[PDB]
Amino acid sequence: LANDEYPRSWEISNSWVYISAICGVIVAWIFFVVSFVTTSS
Amino acid sequence: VDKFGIKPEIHHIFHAEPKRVAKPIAVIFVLIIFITILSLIVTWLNSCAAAFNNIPTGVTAVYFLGFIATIVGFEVIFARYYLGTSIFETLFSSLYLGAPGLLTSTKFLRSFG
Amino acid sequence: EFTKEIKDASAGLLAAGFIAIVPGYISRSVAGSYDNEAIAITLLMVTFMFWIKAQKTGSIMHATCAALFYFYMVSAWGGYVFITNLIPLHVFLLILMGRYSSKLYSAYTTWYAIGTVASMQIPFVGFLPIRSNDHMAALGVFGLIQIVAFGDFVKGQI
Amino acid sequence: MISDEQLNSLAITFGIVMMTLIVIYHAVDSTMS
Amino acid sequence: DFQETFKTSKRAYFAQIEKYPKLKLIDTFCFFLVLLGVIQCTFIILIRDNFPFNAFLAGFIICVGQFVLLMSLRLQLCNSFPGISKNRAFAEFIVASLILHFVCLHFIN
Numbered sequence: 001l002a003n004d005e006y007p008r009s010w011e012i013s014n015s016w017v018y019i020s021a022i023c024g025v026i027v028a029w030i031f032f033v034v035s036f037v038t039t040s041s
Numbered sequence: 042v043d044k045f046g047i048k049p050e051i052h053h054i055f056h057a058e059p060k061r062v063a064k065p066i067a068v069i070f071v072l073i074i075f076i077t078i079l080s081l082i083v084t085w086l087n088s089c090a091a092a093f094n095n096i097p098t099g100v101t102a103v104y105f106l107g108f109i110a111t112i113v114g115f116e117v118i119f120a121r122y123y124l125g126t127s128i129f130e131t132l133f134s135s136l137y138l139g140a141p142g143l144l145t146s147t148k149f150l151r152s153f154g
Numbered sequence: 155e156f157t158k159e160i161k162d163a164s165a166g167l168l169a170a171g172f173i174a175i176v177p178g179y180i181s182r183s184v185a186g187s188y189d190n191e192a193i194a195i196t197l198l199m200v201t202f203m204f205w206i207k208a209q210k211t212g213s214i215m216h217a218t219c220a221a222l223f224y225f226y227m228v229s230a231w232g233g234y235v236f237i238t239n240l241i242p243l244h245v246f247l248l249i250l251m252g253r254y255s256s257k258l259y260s261a262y263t264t265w266y267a268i269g270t271v272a273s274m275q276i277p278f279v280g281f282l283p284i285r286s287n288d289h290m291a292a293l294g295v296f297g298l299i300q301i302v303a304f305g306d307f308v309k310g311q312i
Numbered sequence: 313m314i315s316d317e318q319l320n321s322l323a324i325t326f327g328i329v330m331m332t333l334i335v336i337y338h339a340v341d342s343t344m345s
Numbered sequence: 346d347f348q349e350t351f352k353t354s355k356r357a358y359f360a361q362i363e364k365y366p367k368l369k370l371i372d373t374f375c376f377f378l379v380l381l382g383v384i385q386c387t388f389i390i391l392i393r394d395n396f397p398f399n400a401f402l403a404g405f406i407i408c409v410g411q412f413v414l415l416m417s418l419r420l421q422l423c424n425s426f427p428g429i430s431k432n433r434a435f436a437e438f439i440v441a442s443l444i445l446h447f448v449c450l451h452f453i454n
């Protein structure tokens with residue numbers, strides 16, 4: 001089997017928890033960068 | 042009696058494909074993660090950790106927007122890589138975003154800090 | 155560059171002149187020799203260069219460059235494991251001599267995280283960085299440097 | 313094309329020149345600083 | 346014994362963190378980046394299976410890498426390194442974070 005012939009991550013119920021984590025982390029990271037540059041010490 | 046008669050049939054015996062967890066437990070854990078992220082954002086905003094006080098104004102503002110666009114932009118690129126976009130198109134979009142994005146981000150950081 | 159990072163530029167020029175024509179390297183890089191080493195000995199050196207620049211300055215960018223060229227070497231040659239065992243040892247020794255600093259934490263932690271997550275993308279390597287013995291030193295030093303770091307902060311109180 | 317003895321002489325000349333120039337550089341770096 | 350030390354450390358931390366907002370930001374982020382990790386491990390233990398191991402490794406390594414990068418940023422912000430300003434530490438952090446994000450998105454397939 002080739003590399004692009006396996007089932008995708010969004011099709012296996014187990015990976016659902018692991019994609020959500022990654023997705024949440026990335027969104028939080030974007031907010032952190034903005035909030036970092038727009039705050040004053 | 043060999044070499045002459047009919048031989049019995051043979052059938053391959055296949056292995057077992059891995060079992061997948063039932064959907065409700067995965068859904069519960071996704072809800073847990075969503076609640077956790079909502080907690081993070083509300084925690085940041087409630088505390089003065091993030092207070093949006095040093096907002097750029099004037100010409101610096103546009104540099105700020107360019108920095109923001111470069112940051113979100115790369116993320117979007119990666120997401121489209123996650124959806125099925127090739128690696129060559131990904132490298133080309135990354136170069137096209139990274140030249141002027143780098144210029145604008147360096148100017149913003151050099152002028153606001 | 156690496157020898158300029160060690161002593162100075164004159165020593166670096168001597169080292170370059172030496173390595174240009176020394177037979178121990180020419181034995182496996184003669185025109186026609188198209189084996190894995192033809193590029194590996196290059197990448198190795200580059201990696202080490204960046205790591206040195208990462209270890210004494212504390213830069214995150216130089217540790218990221220070291221990790222990227224370490225990924226290049228993992229993708230190019232099977233003796234990458236040498237580097238996977240040499241960079242931790244270094245750090246470990248610096249811990250025993252009493253020479254821990256925040257630059258060490260920055261450099262080593264950045265290198266380990268990025269290079270480890272990146273070296274598992276080569277299908278021939280796979281999950282070996284987490285299940286093999288020749289990769290267990292690095293991971294170990296990735297834990298120790300935490301316990302030290304936190305402990306250092308406690309030392310600031312008492 | 314180039315011969316074998318010619319390529320040997322060329323390699324040796326390149327080496328000798330390189331070593332002489334690295335020695336001169338080192339002498340100027342060590343003396344003037 | 347250690348109770349007085351812990352109390353003094355708590356006072357010191359609450360001081361520093363409300364005298365510098367950014368160190369608060371970072372701290373909060375790091376804490377939740379621990380929480381997420383814990384959650385994922387809980388899932389792997391509860392369901393007693395590791396069918397897609399690359400997916401778990403990606404989801405876990407993204408959290409530990411973001412944590413260690415934030416800690417390096419915090420160390421460079423509390424007491425800066427000789428030849429590296431705070432702007433340059435922030436930009437290096439951004440570049441390293443983007444690279445880690447890309448590698449962890451490739452890992453999970």
Ligand SMILES: *[C@@H]1O[C@H](CO)[C@@H](O[C@@H]2O[C@H](CO)[C@@H](O[C@@H]3O[C@H](CO[C@H]4O[C@H](CO)[C@@H](O)[C@H](O)[C@@H]4O)[C@@H](O)[C@H](O[C@H]4O[C@H](CO)[C@@H](O)[C@H](O)[C@@H]4O[C@H]4O[C@H](CO)[C@@H](O)[C@H](O)[C@@H]4O[C@H]4O[C@H](CO)[C@@H](O)[C@H](O)[C@@H]4O)[C@@H]3O)[C@H](O)[C@H]2NC(C)=O)[C@H](O)[C@H]1NC(C)=O
Nearest residue numbers: 001043044047048049050051052053054055056057058278
């Ligand atoms: C590296 O190179 C080397 C050398 O080139 C490779 O080594 C070869 O590997 C082969 C396997 O891939 C191996 O072949 C097998 O040998 C087994 C042992 O045979 C010896 O012992 C038996 C007694 O048990 C003797 O009778 C026999 O003469 C030998 O001395 C056999 O058991 C295997 O036979 C099975 O497969 C063949 C074809 O696949 C069938 O024709 C045969 O009838 C057997 O089929 C059963 O099993 C398969 C699954 O394996 C089922 O699909 C099938 O339906 C049958 O299942 C029934 O029977 C089983 C009991 O066997 C029962 O449990 C089940 O319920 C069913 O009732 C096969 O012949 C070579 O010998 C070996 N060569 C050497 C020199 O070692 C090596 O693979 C390479 N490495 C790699 C590629 O990584």
Ligand SMILES: CCCCC/C=C\C/C=C\CCCCCCCC(=O)O[C@H](COC(=O)CCCCCCCCCCCCCCC)COP(=O)([O-])OCC[N+](C)(C)C
Nearest residue numbers: 122123125126127128229272275276277443444447448451
């Ligand atoms: C801010 C900057 C951000 C960018 C960062 C850039 C680089 C990060 C550094 C390291 C990341 C390593 C992981 C990326 C691997 C991409 C390969 C790929 O692409 O192969 C992939 C898959 O094959 C593989 O896995 C096999 C592994 C490939 C081994 C690497 C080849 C060796 C080359 C070494 C470098 C040579 C230097 C250039 C020559 C001088 C093809 O993908 P696809 O075309 O099917 O697209 C579909 C996208 N799906 C899949 C998500 C849907």
Ligand SMILES: CCCCC/C=C\C/C=C\CCCCCCCC(=O)O[C@H](COC(=O)CCCCCCCCCCCCCCC)COP(=O)([O-])OCC[N+](C)(C)C
Nearest residue numbers: 185313314315316317318319320321322323324325326327
């Ligand atoms: C960055 C630093 C780089 C440092 C240098 C690196 C590598 C060089 C070191 C060693 C390489 C040795 C090469 C041996 C030659 C094998 C072929 C041979 O032997 O040619 C010789 C001939 O030669 C010559 O007359 C060449 C004379 C002068 C050449 C022009 C100067 C060269 C400039 C180089 C760059 C030019 C680009 C300009 C852009 C500004 C054999 O000709 P033939 O009989 O086979 O031709 C067929 C017969 N007709 C002649 C009738 C056609």
Ligand SMILES: C[C@H]1CC[C@]2(OC1)O[C@H]1[C@H](O)[C@@H]3[C@H]4CC[C@@H]5C[C@H](O[C@H]6O[C@@H](CO)[C@H](O)[C@@H](O)[C@@H]6O)[C@@H](O)C[C@@]5(C)[C@@H]4CC[C@@]3(C)[C@@H]1[C@H]2C
Nearest residue numbers: 010011016019020021022023024025027071074075078079
């Ligand atoms: C706070 C942060 C973290 C959480 C997150 O960002 C914000 O917000 C999450 C969403 O909740 C997303 C999930 C929604 C449910 C969705 C079910 C799909 O399954 C479909 O499959 C089709 C084929 O049969 C069927 O036709 C359809 O009916 C069936 O719904 C599956 O593909 C993807 C999945 C699980 C999403 C994954 C990513 C998540 C967790 C997102 C994160 C990035």
Ligand SMILES: C[C@H]1CC[C@]2(OC1)O[C@H]1[C@H](O)[C@@H]3[C@H]4CC[C@@H]5C[C@H](O[C@H]6O[C@@H](CO)[C@H](O)[C@@H](O)[C@@H]6O)[C@@H](O)C[C@@]5(C)[C@@H]4CC[C@@]3(C)[C@@H]1[C@H]2C
Nearest residue numbers: 010011019020022023024026116119120121122123124450
């Ligand atoms: C990069 C971060 C951010 C982005 C994201 O997280 C990681 O990565 C996204 C994925 O792209 C996910 C989608 C995949 C496609 C999938 C199609 C399903 O439907 C199809 O089902 C087929 C058979 O059943 C029918 O043949 C088709 O016609 C029909 O469209 C749909 O149900 C769910 C959907 C849209 C997934 C939802 C979650 C997404 C958007 C994920 C995000 C949270």
Ligand SMILES: C[C@H]1CC[C@]2(OC1)O[C@H]1[C@H](O)[C@@H]3[C@H]4CC[C@@H]5C[C@H](O[C@H]6O[C@@H](CO)[C@H](O)[C@@H](O)[C@@H]6O)[C@@H](O)C[C@@]5(C)[C@@H]4CC[C@@]3(C)[C@@H]1[C@H]2C
Nearest residue numbers: 008010110113114116117118120121122123124125126127
């Ligand atoms: C300010 C915001 C503005 C909106 C946005 O962020 C910034 O910027 C948008 C982009 O324009 C994205 C689109 C790109 C084109 C892409 C084509 C896809 O087709 C794929 O379909 C797959 C199966 O589902 C196949 O496997 C693949 O091969 C095949 O390419 C389509 O499905 C999704 C689509 C339209 C992207 C969706 C997310 C968008 C809208 C992004 C938003 C988040």
Ligand SMILES: C[C@H]1CC[C@]2(OC1)O[C@H]1[C@H](O)[C@@H]3[C@H]4CC[C@@H]5C[C@H](O[C@H]6O[C@@H](CO)[C@H](O)[C@@H](O)[C@@H]6O)[C@@H](O)C[C@@]5(C)[C@@H]4CC[C@@]3(C)[C@@H]1[C@H]2C
Nearest residue numbers: 059277280281282283284285286293394395396397398399
């Ligand atoms: C503190 C340290 C010490 C403890 C440890 O590390 C952390 O924690 C253990 C985990 O329990 C790991 C195993 C889980 C099961 C997992 C199945 C994979 O199988 C895949 O194999 C692919 C072929 O390439 C297929 O394509 C995929 O479909 C298929 O899922 C296999 O590769 C790796 C394996 C066995 C894990 C690595 C080793 C273990 C024991 C780890 C130890 C070293």
Ligand SMILES: C[C@H]1CC[C@]2(OC1)O[C@H]1[C@H](O)[C@@H]3[C@H]4CC[C@@H]5C[C@H](O[C@H]6O[C@@H](CO)[C@H](O)[C@@H](O)[C@@H]6O)[C@@H](O)C[C@@]5(C)[C@@H]4CC[C@@]3(C)[C@@H]1[C@H]2C
Nearest residue numbers: 313314315316317318319320321322323324325326327329
């Ligand atoms: C700045 C960079 C670029 C330039 C360069 O690197 C440094 O420096 C060049 C040298 O000048 C080299 C030449 C030396 C002279 C030598 C004469 C032979 O001439 C034959 O032909 C008749 C001639 O009268 C007779 O019969 C015999 O002398 C003899 O057999 C000829 O074979 C080889 C040749 C020309 C060398 C080739 C490589 C050169 C061009 C070198 C380049 C790679």
Ligand SMILES: C[C@H]1CC[C@]2(OC1)O[C@H]1[C@H](O)[C@@H]3[C@H]4CC[C@@H]5C[C@H](O[C@H]6O[C@@H](CO)[C@H](O)[C@@H](O)[C@@H]6O)[C@@H](O)C[C@@]5(C)[C@@H]4CC[C@@]3(C)[C@@H]1[C@H]2C
Nearest residue numbers: 317320321322323324325326327328329330331332333336
């Ligand atoms: C600033 C610069 C300017 C001046 C210079 O550098 C510094 O100072 C010159 C030297 O005088 C060099 C020559 C030495 C003699 C040597 C004889 C070899 O010939 C045979 O010598 C036998 C001996 O044992 C072998 O047995 C044989 O194998 C071998 O072929 C010949 O190959 C190379 C040659 C001529 C050197 C070339 C470079 C020179 C001219 C150098 C110049 C470029």
Ligand SMILES: [Mn+2]
Nearest residue numbers: 188189190191
């Ligand atoms: Mn070989």
